[PDB]
Assembly symmetry: C2
Homo-oligomer: 202 residues x 2
Amino acid sequence: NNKFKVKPLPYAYDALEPYIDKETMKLHHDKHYQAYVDKLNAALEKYPELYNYSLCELLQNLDSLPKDIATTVRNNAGGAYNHKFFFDIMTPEKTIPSESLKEAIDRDFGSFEKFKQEFQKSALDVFGSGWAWLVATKDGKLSIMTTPNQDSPVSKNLTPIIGLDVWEHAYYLKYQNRRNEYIDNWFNVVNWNGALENYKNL
Amino acid sequence: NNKFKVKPLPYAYDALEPYIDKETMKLHHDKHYQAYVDKLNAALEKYPELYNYSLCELLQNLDSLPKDIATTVRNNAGGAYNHKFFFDIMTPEKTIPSESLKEAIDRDFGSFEKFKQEFQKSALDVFGSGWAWLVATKDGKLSIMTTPNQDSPVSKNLTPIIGLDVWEHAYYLKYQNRRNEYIDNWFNVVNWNGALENYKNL
Ligand SMILES: [Fe+3]
Ligand SMILES: [Fe+3]
């Protein structure tokens, strides 16, 4: 069996309280993330060799996949990848920026605080469903960008370092329309050690 | 003062229970709808003569508005129009299809039940944020279409007859990920008399 799988949450469903509620963690992981994986798997039944691609490879080749599944793959491989990534980029442990990522953030944004303000503004300005990302080019240059729906920076050959889901399902139970508060609180659970790994894997 | 305004909810905030919760009605009308109107008004300060356009006229002329506000108008005039329309198309009163709309639905979809099934499927399949619509061409031909975000059929010269908001803020508090249940329940509050008026105004 080489079907795609849901990665078990890397911590307890309530580990991120009080910043993100346990009910949302359960829905977000067990329902939304699960649905993306199931839908992806269903679509690939027609082309079982695609089960041997990684999610990255699917996302890097959307324009060359068979026309009849390309959009479904974009959306569902997108959702699967983005959510695996998102749950991995948060943690109940306390972390801070360090090593090359810490330096790069200062280099590219002037300071951690300037980076944080830009990120929060971008997250806040996403219209409709989508994501805010800290991304790196192949040479380690950092920038902030957003994607709609489940589109991913990976498809534009950019490497996600951190990313924030701003689909309303990610925050409505606790914050309702107050996305600004959700964004501000989320920085308490960003896994900067994971982010460093992401940046190093360039 | 010819600034755009929020239309007061046409019924009590709990009038649509148990199909839509009062808390959602309050957020949806008092926060989300309100924000679209405020943002629209803010953007038009630069071009005060646009306050004399109707929402329809703004939406029918997005490609010819000044470049610097066109997208903001699309999104916010869109949200303002769509929400005014949406709250008007629901009611606590019991209503059924009648007159020309009743006939047209049978003509164009075969039966009310076939129309309802197609509408629910379209509503269910919207990916990300958006709307499902029953629309009419200028000659009264009916069809079902969806729009993303706050895009409107009005911009494609189609006349909305009914429409369902499937942004997650419209249903998450009560239904969470279970959009199917939200869609099914919503048919209990569709204002078919309003829909008939919409159809007659062709
Ligand atoms: Fe999500
Ligand atoms: Fe809405």
